[PDB]
Amino acid sequence: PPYTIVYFPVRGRCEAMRMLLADQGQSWKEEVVTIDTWMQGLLKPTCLYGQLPKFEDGDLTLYQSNAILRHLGRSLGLYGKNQREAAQMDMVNDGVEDLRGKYVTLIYTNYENGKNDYVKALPGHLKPFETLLSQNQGGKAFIVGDQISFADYNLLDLLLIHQVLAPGALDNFPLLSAYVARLSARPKIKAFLSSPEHVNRPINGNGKQ
Amino acid sequence: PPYTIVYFPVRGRCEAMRMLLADQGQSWKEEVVTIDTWMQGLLKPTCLYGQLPKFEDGDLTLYQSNAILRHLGRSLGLYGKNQREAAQMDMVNDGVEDLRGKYVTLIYTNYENGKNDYVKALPGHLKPFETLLSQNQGGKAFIVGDQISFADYNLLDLLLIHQVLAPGALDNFPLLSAYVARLSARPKIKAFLSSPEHVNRPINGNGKQ
Numbered sequence: 109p110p111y112t113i114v115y116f117p118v119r120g121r122c123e124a125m126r127m128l129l130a131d132q133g134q135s136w137k138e139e140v141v142t143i144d145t146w147m148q149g150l151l152k153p154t155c156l157y158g159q160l161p162k163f164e165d166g167d168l169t170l171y172q173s174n175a176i177l178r179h180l181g182r183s184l185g186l187y188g189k190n191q192r193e194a195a196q197m198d199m200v201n202d203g204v205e206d207l208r209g210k211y212v213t214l215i216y217t218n219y220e221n222g223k224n225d226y227v228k229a230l231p232g233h234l235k236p237f238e239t240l241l242s243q244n245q246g247g248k249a250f251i252v253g254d255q256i257s258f259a260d261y262n263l264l265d266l267l268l269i270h271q272v273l274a275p276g277a278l279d280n281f282p283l284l285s286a287y288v289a290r291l292s293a294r295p296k297i298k299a300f301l302s303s304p305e306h307v308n309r310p311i312n313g314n315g316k317q
Numbered sequence: 318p319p320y321t322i323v324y325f326p327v328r329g330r331c332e333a334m335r336m337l338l339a340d341q342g343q344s345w346k347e348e349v350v351t352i353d354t355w356m357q358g359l360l361k362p363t364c365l366y367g368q369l370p371k372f373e374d375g376d377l378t379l380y381q382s383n384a385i386l387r388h389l390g391r392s393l394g395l396y397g398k399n400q401r402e403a404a405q406m407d408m409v410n411d412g413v414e415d416l417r418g419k420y421v422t423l424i425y426t427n428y429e430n431g432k433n434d435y436v437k438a439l440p441g442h443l444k445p446f447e448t449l450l451s452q453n454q455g456g457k458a459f460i461v462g463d464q465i466s467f468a469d470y471n472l473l474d475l476l477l478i479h480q481v482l483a484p485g486a487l488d489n490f491p492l493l494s495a496y497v498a499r500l501s502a503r504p505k506i507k508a509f510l511s512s513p514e515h516v517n518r519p520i521n522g523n524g525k526q
């Protein structure tokens with residue numbers, strides 16, 4: 109700490125890290141970058157890869173959302189109890205990222221002509237996570253192990269935005285449905301998902317969801 | 318150990334982990350999966366996300382090429398000396414993965430009409446790495462710190478395949494140019510690059526590069 113999130117005024121690739129920080133009783137500063145400011149092209153060239161979010165943790169400045177998540181997981185003790193779990197958490201998080209990428213592509217470049225197809229192939233992309241849960245404590249714990257990890261927050265966010273994209277998304281996924289509800293009931297999470305900062309923030313930059 | 322790699326008969330997303338292993342004096346098993354076999358539909362359904370590569374350390378089965386790289390780097394001591402370096406290495410690796418995905422799309426779905434534009438935009442995508450190096454001992458050491466990390470093997474592979482795609486891609490990037498020469502000059506790595514299993518193996522599965 110202190111923690112500072114530099115991002116556009118949307119949930120997008122930052123809602124997961126915010127739930128993590130909130131569920132760990134951490135406070136952070138939000139630096140909102142409007143599209144107008146970004147179009148001026150002043151901040152963009154200063155970003156390592158020309159993109160946001162940008163994260164500041166004390167003297168450390170990071171880019172790449174997944175790198176930020178892993179940093180928080182490693183520093184706040186949300187990365188498993190050993191190398192074996194750490195590897196499994198990375199495997200889970202990479203899967204989460206692959207789906208988010210496709211979700212993003214759908215939202216921003218082909219929403220009206222590709223939603224039906226996307227929702228059609230969605231169960232196939234969610235099944236792996238249902239399987240993962242079934243293999244861990246029968247699915248009554250977390251995605252990996254008995255302790256919540258950064259992967260959980262990223263996966264939770266992914267599942268939540270897909271339930272908005274497709275209402276009955278988890279109908280045929282009992283473990284994932286109970287998983288989402290279980291984590292959403294976590295006091296700090298419930299409070300976060302209920303806060304105005306979160307409610308007032310649109311899921312994506314084009315309003316589509 | 319023992320290490321087993323289940324992948325297609327290409328370098329693709331496994332050449333990086335392969336150089337890493339070889340450079341660490343490690344040996345492994347190569348289970349080559351041909352297109353024909355893959356189209357038989359027996360292995361795919363058994364893969365966590367329906368894709369390869371698949372990895373086996375003996376008791377632990379992994380998927381996601383970056384999870385594998387991170388796992389090897391973590392268990393073999395190639396993940397930095399502290400939390401700060403590990404975070405920056407992740408930031409590096411994420412950036413490498415971002416460009417690899419675009420590289421992959423070009424080669425497999427739009428090589429002909431997209432190469433011109435891709436190579437034109439390539440300098441802008443490599444610059445960040447040139448910059449990172451200039452901020453780490455003038456680029457005399459590694460991508461992050463002075464110790465080789467899983468991130469270095471991934472970046473090296475990325476730079477090498479782009480050198481074949483666009484000769485002179487590093488003409489305006491002296492630090493990256495040297496970076497590649499040096500690491501490729503490493504005894505274990507140099508031996509790998511000259512091995513028949515590597516030499517005979519195509520970069521991609523569609524004969525393009």
Ligand SMILES: N[C@@H](CCC(=O)N[C@@H](CSCc1ccc([N+](=O)[O-])cc1)C(=O)NCC(=O)O)C(=O)O
Nearest residue numbers: 116117118120121143158159160161172173174313
């Ligand atoms: N791999 C990187 C990917 C980052 C990325 O896609 N960043 C986008 C924003 S998230 C998606 C997004 C886009 C636009 C808005 N908006 O409000 O206008 C919000 C979110 C960006 O910086 N775009 C600016 C640019 O490239 O010039 C990561 O995971 O952090």
Ligand SMILES: N[C@@H](CCC(=O)N[C@@H](CSCc1ccc([N+](=O)[O-])cc1)C(=O)NCC(=O)O)C(=O)O
Nearest residue numbers: 206325326327329352367368369370381382383522
């Ligand atoms: N995020 C995953 C992505 C894995 C991925 O894209 N895997 C591809 C192979 S690498 C790219 C590739 C494609 C084809 C060949 N080939 O020889 O025909 C080789 C490599 C795959 O399994 N495709 C099968 C499928 O989706 O059905 C990772 O990083 O490991």
